[PDB]
Design a protein around this ligand. Structure first.
Ligand SMILES: Cc1cc(CCCOc2c(C)cc(-c3noc(C(F)(F)F)n3)cc2C)on1
Ligand SMILES: Cc1cc(CCCOc2c(C)cc(-c3noc(C(F)(F)F)n3)cc2C)on1
Lengths: 297, 243, 40, 297, 243, 40, 40, 40
């Protein structure tokens, strides 16, 4: 294990006709990748490469803020003949699989240990009714409440589970900067697992699903409009962004090829034809001797 | 109080910003660190791992057929056996590789590539191949007389089952771009071509139609820049629980 | 790193660790392969 | 190469009638500019000049914030009978040629290496409809997403390319200060080139255009209104400003005379008559012996 | 928290502000610096380079005709040959120069100018000219007796083909302004005039009608201030891709 | 210069470099021209 | 703790006191119980 | 006190002066009264 701030330098190489030395030949059967250097495969010049590697660090590769949740509910009076339930909120059931870019990028490793910075971005639209005159978006107070595993969830906007005496909650308005906080590495294990070759229950029943991990039960995010209902219908759209920090990554995986279909498992249907079809990942060319983008003069 | 002026960039959310934030679980004790084998510190470690190429990406090969190249005894001499496009950005043999998939998360790249070919015929089957890397400028070679003039390695089958060809970093610019225009000077790497040096010779007891598996990796002089969302994966809707 | 908060996990992106050991994945063999040597 | 914080001082000079010394005569044929000093052309006094030069530094000359993009789209429901495309965004294809003041100023050098500070200034107007009652501009959330070369571009406001898990994106509202960030020197080469005497493709076809550089393929800026459509039509105008920082400049050019016509090449039509006509750059005067602004008493 | 008061100038975008900003590409490695010849550190280096003047900016000269002054053998004596307005801000011979174009990006200027004239007749053609810089106050001289009383140089043609006249910094104020009013005390530099000292004498074998090319540059005592958008370039719309 | 961010390219306008070499453009001649001398 | 205000009670959450004496509640007996001993 | 401004009168509430002399108001007598003594 050596320090690599810049890519390897190239050393000047000479003609070499030596018996018993075959640097260009390797045995792939050992499981070892070819160790052949350019210096010993061709005649090379001295090159002092000052290309930096900091952008290919797993901290930089995974430590960008990515969307992990998009939920939209109608902000209005949901009350009817006999309901008494205001329903101006949503519950998510925390996960990192709903959006494929962060999922596929996280799924390039088996295990990840990171503290996560979260950023919530709310947006309002007036609901296009029969008689609706627009004149501006109310500066509503929102409450995002993390309900951990085994805590009572809210059933209404007006519920008293919103007390949040011990539940972590953040209050933030529409016209303010998007809410932000850091959640620590909060697994019962020493790393998060993107794949579980097993079951999360002690029973052998169908109801006990394959792939579900007994460390991904992370609880729920409950977000409400704190303001009581307006005289008109609004649509609140909430976007939650995840930025992994202080990242450790283990056991790199084969990248996902087929499009995801759900968040409970890694099943696939594949696309009808190449690319990313079950029988053809790379698009077809005419023959093994055909260059599809051959430069013609 | 502290004299204050809110600058341009105040009240903005930048997805690539590097700032400390409010801890939601105050005085929370995270699980003690435990040693796990195969810890990755850099994406440049993964692109250095060999991965098979779909050299046989044709509309007659299905599944595992696409990762092997059928090499046969020829009733001819000097003939071209197979080609490899080096357009990582475009749908080609290098796309679905560790190099391809992870480099495809970036826009700029520099450094030498290694391509290793494993011969998978019989112990009794012999042969000599010539694999050539043609730097860009003109057309892909179809005659061995033209291909031999570029960077090449002559491959003798034997106890060492595999050969490496170093595709050396030969470009005017410090970096190349993963561009949708393959014929662009910024993007084009050139051509890899394989010809018969002598022939494939198999005795009656051994099969005449053998196979070659091609692998590609990056060398230690390899670099990537300007991270981007990979075009490998797409989404038309929020992924549901079931469907 | 800077960190204006009490907890250490609240801090910004960690100081760049440029340590690389690709041998874990590229040459994970009991007996090391010597450069130029027939590796049989 | 010497340090010049203040302009050159003038030294007192005397009468000089010396054979073999002709400081006022030069040979222009050598390519060298005249080396004649005022001290040796006329009788001068001692002057201690304390005029500073910091304002004529290329850092100061180029390092002002200049407009580089102005795009306006309609913020409304673009949906029809069968579209399902919201179209509340634009794509620019990054460049520095659309606006002539920054173009002509940058085009005074062949090569530039600078890190660039960008500032985005959004503005809303209510669309003047048949029945439109104004009462105030909604505090909309905007997303500017840099889509690098070879990445999937968004086709709609509601597209999932906006994930931006690895694409650099900035979220900023209307009533906030204008969004700002620094893009680094991001050329595949050691400097940006304002002119390319060549082609960017290996083919010799018409489709391969002269002047296009294979280092100016900088990707695209995609900017969206994050908020879903309002009940009324708004017009969002976005202004992007560029401030070069940490500038190195090489090979100074002859300044542009003819008005620019496009961003793909440096072609010209010229103005019908002087000034800046193809056959007359400077305006006409009656004769070579005529002073047009002659002071009369 | 840190005690804070948002001052006037908070939430403002000033196009001339000097502040650090959020890096969009975190830990991005820019291309290594490479030596390129002709590096410019100051705009004052470019204004010191000679550039041709349109002395013949008349409605009978087209293109390259405008950058040369037709000097002929005179059937007279002491006669004026050509004039040069020194109004950089106004449409005059100095506008389309390196001095003009780059100084025209500023509002204030100070320092001595050099104007070099190259004679382009025959080796056998001789002559003596007198070029005079008249400081401002009154009318431009039309008689040599009046012009000779100002700063001047007498030019003998020979092996050294060019002459310099230093237009020396002669002003009450430390700076002059690039003002639209030419007759303003803040703007006016005065006059440059060229008369015949003797005559142009060419033998029968040589052409009688020769040419002079005038160049102008700044000296090391030259300064510019108060940057502005140049009036040289205009725009009626966003420049399209094609038209 | 100040810079509140990790990257060096994020810093403000660079510290004034007053180095001038106009000879690159004004006297780019193999044999230097001497002041007052006939330069032929 | 930090505190930007004059009063000490205005300060943030106090520096973690990890002192524990559960014997107050778990063994509040005049004669101490010895581990392994018959406690009668 | 802190004060971010040039003038001294712009400063916050002045540093607590705990000096007390209630004798000014409680025993403002030429000849001091002795404790326990008949004060006639
Ligand atoms: C797998 C896997 C799962 C994780 C952790 C994801 C973090 O989950 C969250 C998210 C996305 C948001 C909040 C949150 N947002 O707001 C609040 C608050 F308001 F309660 F503070 N909490 C809390 C957690 C644990 O990391 N790897
Ligand atoms: C020629 C030439 C081209 C350049 C660089 C111009 C910078 O281009 C931009 C611009 C103008 C804006 C953004 C940008 N604006 O916002 C965002 C973000 F939101 F994605 F962060 N990126 C990114 C780049 C590379 O310098 N010389």
């Amino acid at each position: 294990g050596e320090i690599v701030k810049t890519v390897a330098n190239t050393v000047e190489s000479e003609i070499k006709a030596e018996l018993g030395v075959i640097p260009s030949l390797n045995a792939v059967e050992t499981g070892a990748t070819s160790n052949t250097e350019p210096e010993e495969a061709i005649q090379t010049r001295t090159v002092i490469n000052m290309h930096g590697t900091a952008e290919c660090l797993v901290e930089n590769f995974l430590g960008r803020s990515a969307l992990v949740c998009m939920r939209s509910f109608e902000y209005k009076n949901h009350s009817t003949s006999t309901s008494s339930i205001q329903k101006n909120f949503f519950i998510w059931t925390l996960n990192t699989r709903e959006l494929v870019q962060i999922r596929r990028k996280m799924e390039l490793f088996t295990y990840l240990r990171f503290d996560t910075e979260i950023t919530i971005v709310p947006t309002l639209r007036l609901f296009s009714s029969s008689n609706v005159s627009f004149s501006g978006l109310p500066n509503l107070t929102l409450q995002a409440m993390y309900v951990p595993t085994g805590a009572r969830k809210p059933s209404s906007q007006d519920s008293f589970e919103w007390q949040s005496a011990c539940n972590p909650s953040v209050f933030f308005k529409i016209n303010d900067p998007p809410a932000r906080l850091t959640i620590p590495f909060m697994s019962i294990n020493s790393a998060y697992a993107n794949f579980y070759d097993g079951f999360a229950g002690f029973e052998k029943k169908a109801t006990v699903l394959y792939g579900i991990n007994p460390a991904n039960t992370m609880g729920n995010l409950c977000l409400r409009v704190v303001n009581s209902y307006q005289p008109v219908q609004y649509t609140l759209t909430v976007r939650v962004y995840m930025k992994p920090k202080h990242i450790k990554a283990w056991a790199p995986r084969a990248p996902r090829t087929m499009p995801y279909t759900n968040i409970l498992n890694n099943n696939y249907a594949g696309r009808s034809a190449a690319p990313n079809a079950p029988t053809a990942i790379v698009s077809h060319r005419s023959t093994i001797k055909t260059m599809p983008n051959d430069i013609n003069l | 109080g502290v004299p204050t002026c809110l600058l341009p960039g105040s009240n903005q959310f930048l997805t690539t910003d590097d700032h400390s934030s409010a801890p939601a679980f105050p005085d929370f004790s995270p699980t003690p660190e435990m040693h796990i084998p195969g810890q990755v510190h850099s994406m440049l470690e993964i692109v250095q791992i060999e991965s098979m190429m779909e050299i046989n990406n044709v509309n007659d090969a299905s599944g595992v057929e696409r990762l092997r190249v059928q090499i046969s005894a020829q009733s001819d001499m000097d003939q071209l056996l197979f080609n490899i496009p080096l357009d990582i950005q475009l749908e080609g043999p290098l796309r679905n590789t560790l190099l391809g998939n992870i480099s495809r998360y970036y826009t700029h790249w520099s450094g030498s590539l290694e391509m290793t070919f494993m011969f998978c015929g019989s112990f009794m089957t012999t042969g000599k191949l010539i694999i050539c890397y043609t730097p860009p400028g003109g057309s892909s070679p179809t005659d061995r007389m033209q291909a031999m003039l570029a960077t090449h390695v002559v491959w003798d089958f034997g106890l060492q089952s595999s050969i490496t060809i170093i595709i050396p970093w030969i470009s005017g610019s410090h970096y190349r771009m993963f561009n949708t225009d393959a014929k662009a000077i910024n993007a084009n790497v050139g051509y890899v071509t394989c010809f018969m040096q002598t022939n494939l010779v198999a005795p009656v007891g051994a099969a005449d139609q053998c196979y070659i598996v091609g692998m590609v990796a990056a060398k230690k002089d390899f670099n990537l820049r300007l991270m981007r969302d990979s075009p490998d994966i797409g989404q038309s809707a929020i992924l549901p629980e079931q469907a | 790193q800077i960190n204006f908060y009490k907890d250490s996990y609240a801090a910004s992106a960690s100081k760049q660790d440029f340590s690389q050991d690709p041998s874990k994945f590229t040459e994970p063999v009991a007996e090391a392969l010597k450069a130029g040597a027939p590796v049989l």
